[PDB]
Amino acid sequence: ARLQFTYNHIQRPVNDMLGRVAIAWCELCNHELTLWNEARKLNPNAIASV
Amino acid sequence: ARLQFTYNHIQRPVNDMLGRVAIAWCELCNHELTLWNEARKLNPNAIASV
Ligand SMILES: *[C@@H]1O[C@H](CO)[C@@H](O[C@@H]2O[C@H](CO)[C@@H](O)[C@H](O)[C@H]2NC(C)=O)[C@H](O)[C@H]1NC(C)=O
Ligand SMILES: *[C@@H]1O[C@H](CO)[C@@H](O[C@@H]2O[C@H](CO)[C@@H](O)[C@H](O)[C@H]2NC(C)=O)[C@H](O)[C@H]1NC(C)=O
Q: What are the phi and psi torsion angles at A7 (to 5°)? A: -125, 95
Our measurement of the distance from residue B36's CA atom to the centroid of its chain's CA atoms, rounded to an integer in Å, reads 16
Please list every residue in chain B whose beta carbon sits closer than 8 Å to the beta carbon of residue A39: 34-35, 38
Given resolution (angstroms): 3.0
Minimum-distance CB partner of A50 among B34, B41, B42: B34
* Experiment type: cryo-EM
Q: What is chain A's percent helix, strand, coil content, to nearest 5?
A: 80, 0, 20
The secondary structure of residue B1, as a DSSP letter, is -
Other Cβ atoms closer than 10 A to B37: 13
